[PDB]
Each structure stands twice: as C-alpha cells, then as structure tokens.
C-alpha cells in the first residue's frame, strides 16, 4: 500500500473505507446519516443541548458535513447495525 496522497473529493480513499462496511451502498447510507446528524448538530447548537453529538474529529476551516462524516468513518469512530 504505497499510493500517492489523495486530494480533494477522493480523501479518504474509498478502498480503505470499504473495509469498514460490507458494500459501497452501506458506506453511502452510513455517511449520509452521519452527515445529517452533524448538520442538525450545527443547527440545534443555539438552543439547549439535546442527544446529538459530533463532529468527533476536528473539521477544517470550512468543511462540508459529508466530508467530516466520511473522515470519521475512516478513523474508526462509529458503529452501526443494518436492517
């Protein structure tokens, strides 16, 4: 595993992401739900604290929530159960 460092939309590499879940569809739904969670954490920050938490990893200067979710995925910071 000696790939050159990725950049932009391909960070983290999807092949290392796929080892965490079964298929890429599971990755899609994983990251979508987690990014939604992060988004409404950002929305529900002004009022009282509720059950939502995150982002567990430190985001960038300005970073889209989905990128944060996928980076959290790659850092082994979540777990799940399918249907």
């Amino acid at each position: 595993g000696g790939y050159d460092t990725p950049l932009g939309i391909t960070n983290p590499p999807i092949d290392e992401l796929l080892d965490r879940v079964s298929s890429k569809y599971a990755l899609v739904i994983y990251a979508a739900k987690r990014a939604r969670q992060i988004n409404d954490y950002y929305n529900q920050l002004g009022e009282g604290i509720l059950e939502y938490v995150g982002p567990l990893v430190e985001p960038g200067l300005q970073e889209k929530p989905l990128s944060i979710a996928l980076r959290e995925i790659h850092a082994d910071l979540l777990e799940h159960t399918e249907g």
Binding site: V53, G54, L56, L77, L78, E79
Partner: peptide
C-alpha cells in the same frame, strides 16, 4: 462507545 466517551 470509545469515541463517544472520548467526546
């Protein structure tokens, strides 16, 4: 659980 405790 580990990172929820970390937070």
């Amino acid at each position: 659980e580990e990172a929820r405790a970390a937070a």
